[PDB]
């Protein structure tokens, strides 16, 4: 509907970069506490991207301190400030969920050239 997609192009942003599955993503989330509002990083592989225009998302996974953390985002939301790629890889899938039960040396993704 063009009554949906007339207001689903006002809320969106034009400052989102491009990434495939299987790469490390640096995400700067804004965080409130008290009166200060300040940035906080996030860094891990991304294993699930969902493309729904305004409703798009992805999932970042990192083994922080032993307790493995997954976290989905809302791509066109004002809680994310900026997103950067850091090292892009080459997986032949696009829902990497075998990187859930797998830790350490054998849970790698090899580098992508070009």
């Amino acid at each position: 509907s063009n009554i949906i997609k007339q207001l689903e192009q006002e809320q969106m942003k034009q400052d989102v970069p491009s990434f495939r599955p299987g790469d490390t993503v640096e995400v700067k989330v804004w965080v409130v506490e008290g009166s200060k509002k300040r940035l906080q990083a996030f860094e891990g592989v991304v294993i699930a991207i969902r493309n729904r225009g305004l409703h798009s998302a992805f999932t970042v996974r990192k083994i922080s301190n032993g307790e493995g953390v997954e976290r989905v985002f809302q791509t066109h939301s004002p809680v994310v400030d900026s997103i950067s790629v850091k090292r892009r890889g080459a997986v032949r899938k696009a829902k990497l969920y075998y990187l859930r039960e797998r830790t350490g040396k054998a849970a790698r993704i090899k580098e992508r050239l070009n």
Partner: protein, 209 residues
């Protein structure tokens, strides 16, 4: 107060300066128009009857087209009626603008439901099902027992069993309006108003807020 009639088209979300993801929905509301004004001496009660939308010429019927041209309006699609109170001045030819909700914080929305067919006893009234194992034979989902023995010796009136699920008029109240649209004739209300999309709902200021 003077209600209006909309059509629910989709569901989306308005974001904030902070990052709240407010659920919201878009009921398109064109400018409704007064069709028949009643009062006590004319009919028996003060009210207003209106109609918005569009209907084809070769399927508006000769009873309806006479009522249309008796007023002077276009070929709308419905006929809805709103009760009223005193302290108002009204005519018939004037059409109601879409900005009547532009100063009310909490509204009410009534409409139809969805049609879930001939339902079940585990599905409509939430009867907890029984053992799917452990000896039990051919009674996994039945509603069990329904009456006593011999005194009454009958199934009481008011019992709940299988039947048609919903598909009637339901009401959600006190909802949150966030934004109007003078440009493309919308109402953005927070939540999930009843009925499937492609249906027409009756919106009003909330009766108690």
């Amino acid at each position: 107060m003077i209600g209006l009639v909309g059509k629910k088209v989709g569901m989306t979300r308005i974001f904030t300066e902070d990052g709240v993801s407010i659920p919201v929905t878009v009921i398109e509301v064109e400018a409704n128009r007064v069709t028949q004004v009643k009062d006590l001496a004319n009919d028996g009660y003060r009210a207003i009857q209106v109609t918005t939308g569009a209907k084809k010429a070769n399927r508006v019927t000769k009873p309806e087209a006479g009522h249309f041209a008796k007023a002077g309006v276009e070929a709308g699609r419905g006929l809805w009626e709103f009760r009223l109170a005193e302290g108002e001045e009204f005519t018939v030819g004037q059409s109601i603008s879409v900005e009547l909700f532009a100063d009310v914080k909490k509204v009410d929305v009534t409409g139809t439901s969805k049609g879930k067919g001939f339902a079940g006893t585990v599905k409509r009234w939430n009867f907890r099902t029984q053992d799917a194992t452990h000896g039990n034979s051919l009674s996994h989902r039945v509603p069990g027992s329904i009456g006593q023995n011999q005194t009454p010796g009958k199934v009481f009136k008011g019992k709940k069993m299988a039947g048609q699920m919903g598909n009637e008029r339901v009401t959600v109240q006190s909802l949150d309006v966030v934004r109007v649209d003078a440009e493309r004739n919308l109402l953005l209300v927070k939540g999930a108003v009843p009925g499937a999309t492609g249906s027409d709902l009756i919106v009003k200021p909330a009766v108690k807020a």
